[model samples]
Target: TKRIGVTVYDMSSFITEGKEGMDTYAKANNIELVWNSANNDVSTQASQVDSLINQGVDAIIVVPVQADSLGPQVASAKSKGIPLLAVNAALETPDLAGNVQPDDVAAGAQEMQMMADRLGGKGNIVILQGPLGGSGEINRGKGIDQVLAKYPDIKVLAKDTANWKRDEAVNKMKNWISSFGPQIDGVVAQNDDMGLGALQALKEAGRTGVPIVGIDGIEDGLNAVKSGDFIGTSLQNGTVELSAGLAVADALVKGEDVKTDPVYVMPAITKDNVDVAIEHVVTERQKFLDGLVELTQQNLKTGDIAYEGIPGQT
Candidate 1:
């Protein structure tokens, strides 16, 4: 029997969609998968690494906390000949084989561009960046900064990392808007949850007139856009990336070489063409067509898997 260990930072959230979807596909394909979660703690993650390595997992995939923090663990695993890969997010350096993630910089740039268009090429924008120094957030922030360079009329009034926390973003945005005294013409959040929270802050401050944009157009964000809560968003290709990740894992078990791209770009989701970007779920699922018909509507999502590519493909 083939045995593969699958681990995640959060068992619940990991299993929520893609991880669970991958679980279903694993069962249908008759592959044995041992799964666990680290509960979002880096120490727990490090321990989980030891466990999976000892279990002799064919390969390992990780959603890293600090890109640089896992170097020791990753390098140790590599010495033991375990093929390690990062999903959606990456480790600090080339310690892992490759990574599957959205173009964070591109995603950030898109959000800024959306605001620039709405403001007619000029406006004061407040940005709720993700955690500072985070590989993903830093990339997106740079992209946003680059866009600002193009629009001389657009100035970033206040830029702060939300730490990827919803409540924090709302509080920060609200405070910034009040301190800036209403010249905040635009707001850009790193993710949907943060964006929505910031939106609420703007509403409370009576600054809903400004355009707001975010990344990760999860259902809430899509609904918000449809209801006019946000201007636009960059969604992760969850379904596509998850399916690809699993397929690659299968190849290892079968002793076949698999193909994987280091980076997968995320697609933008906005009111104008949200349907098209979201449709990637169905189209990408076909990559795992050989596994099982785990084709539930829930498995179809562009936002969830946008940054993470199909993990494994044979």
Candidate 2:
């Protein structure tokens, strides 16, 4: 029997769905999954990886909290000869077995484009950056830079790291409001929590005209879009990433060759089409969950194997 160890960042909004996918996939494949949450700490996650390694698990899956600082863990995993699969965030190391994630660069560009058009192509905007050194923060910043490179009129008046927390963003937004006042015409945040936090600050300051945009279409962000509190968001749901990650894990457990890049695509969610986005989220999650039985059946048929490209493929 094969065993897999999963290290999640935490049991928060988006990560919740990803964990659900992991659980279902593990049950269907009859793999002993030793799952642990890092509680959003890099050191804790590294320690957890060590514990899992000591347990002699066959494979490991990681949704890292900090991408650049996992070198030690990666080194340890490599030395142990265990295959490590990266989910959501990319491991900075080059030796990972596989990765499954959304196009964060594109997601960041989507946020900036929405805010740029709302600002009429030229205005001052405040940026709520994510936690420093995280993969999403760095790649999202690159995407923001990509948009700003083309538009010289849009100025980033004040940018600060909000650590991807709503309360931190609320305080940052308040500070930006006090500093820039009405000159700040728009806000672009790295994630939904920060964007919503900025939105509340704008409301409290009586600045209703400022448009706020963010990435990751969690329920709070989707509700904001539906109510027009936020302009839009790039929907990076956990189900997609976790599903692909489990597929990769299944492949590795069976000694199969899988695609190196299984990038999941997440479209932009706007007020005009938020209902459709919501429906997609609900239906897709249920589909993956409901198909667990069939997935197990296939696992049984194919020499108790899985992930020959994908489910039902081999």
Candidate 3:
């Protein structure tokens, strides 16, 4: 079986779902996958890339923690003639074999435009950002800035990085509520995690209907939209993104021509079309679980599996 190395920036919920997608694809295709988590450290991911190169995997996929720090790693992989693909995050280098990720800039623009429309192009809003230097943060921020440029009446009251953590966003929202009070007319969180966190803080302060928007249509974010808490959310499906990366890697390994250009997968969800989005989410989740079960059954048939109890049984 061919082997591939997969390294991610962190094991956050979003990345975790992507990894599960990759795992399902690998098992179904009879590929060996070695996984690594960098915990959001640049040096750690650098070392992990080096180790993968030394292991002589057929190809490697990386979800970069920092955009600019991967130039050396990309050079090293190129020198060794290994196909290196980036998934869910763009490396600063142009030499990557392929990149599979959402159109983060577009997602940012979509969410911001939604918020601007909700507030009628004039409001005081605060922004919640992701890790300061990450690609998602930079590109999404650019998109937001682009939208904001068109609407001079909508002013940003305050903006800060929560590092894409719920608790940090909660605290940041609390401080903003105390400082700005009712002057805060709306919110633009870079992702759903922070959006939900901001909503939590707003509820605690007895503040309601501030017209918040976020990217990343996670389950909670969708439910919030369905219940009329959030105005809308942009969908950046991790499962679809990572699985595309695997397909690109496999093609490269087989000496087949693959497009090196970035593949963007993104959509927006609001109250108008949220029901279909929810159904799609349910179907995809079941497909992933079915893939897992099929892989397990194959292992059992080969007498290479052991378990303490029936799998997926409570």
Candidate 4:
């Protein structure tokens, strides 16, 4: 049987998507698969990769914790002639079977552009970023910077990594409001979960005219856009991106004609067309969170929503 191994960073959300998609692809292709959950720890993820390497699998797929920290392990896997494929999240190094992730840089710039347009291209703003390291933060930060360059009036009140945590985003935004006072006009969060925190901070500061942009286009992010809490965000299809990467990796093992760079595109999510966004989410995410209280419900067990690769409710 064709054999492949997958190392997912978190079994709660992203891992679930990767596994499900990989499992589906493998089933159709006659491949036997082994899945590993890294529990969101870098060291543990490295060890998991090591274990997979020792197992003598056909190829290895990883969603690295810290892309840079994953470099050596990926290099190790490559040295052993393993086709190491990274999905959604990427590794720091260049040598691999090509990463199956959206253009994070483009995703970041899209958020800034949408926020700028929402605020009429001139407004004070803040950026809530994910944790340090990883391609997401690096490229997304650059994208925002580029957007800021085009509009001098769109000043950055502050920019910082909240470790992609909602609480961190809230606290950081609160401090920015207290420091920037009434001057801040817009906000852009690196992802949806953190955007929710930004929403709380914005409302608590008595600011309502301003708009906020978030990423990931998850259920909560979309609902926020619909509810006018978060204006919108640029979206990356986690389900499709990861699943496509898995399929490419599988093809690579068979020396098939998969393009080195599949160039799959992840679209943006916004208020003007959040319904379309919902279609993509429903198709890729495989769950429909009814635009109500269920958007934030992290439990997949109770909803029709599925995380594609992840198990249970994420």
Which is the leading candidate under lDDT?
A: 3
All candidates' TM-scores?
A: 0.81, 0.87, 0.89, 0.81
Q: What is the C-alpha lDDT profile of model 3 across 15-82, one tens digit per residue?
A: 77666767777887778999999988999999999999999998999999888878888898988989
Report the number of the highest-TM-score candidate: 3
TM-score of 4: 0.81
Candidate 1 local Cα displacement, residue 200, angstroms: 1.5
Clash numbers, per candidate: 21, 0, 0, 9
lDDT of 3 at 230: 92
Q: For candidate 2, write residues 1-314 as lDDT tens digits.
A: 78999998777667875567667767777878888998889999999888988898888888888887677777788788887888887777887877776678888887898888787789999999877887888888888889898889999998899887898999999998898899998899999889989998989998785788988777788888888888988777565457567777777768887664566555777876677656545545576566654553454344323231221223
lDDT of 1 by residue, 13-107 (tens): 21344664566666766767777677656778788788889988777777665556677778877898776677766567566654556678887
TM-score of 2: 0.87
Alpha-carbon lDDT, every model: 0.66, 0.77, 0.79, 0.71
Candidate 3 accuracy as TM-score: 0.89
Which 10 consecutive positions of candidate 3 have the poorest summed lDDT? 305-314
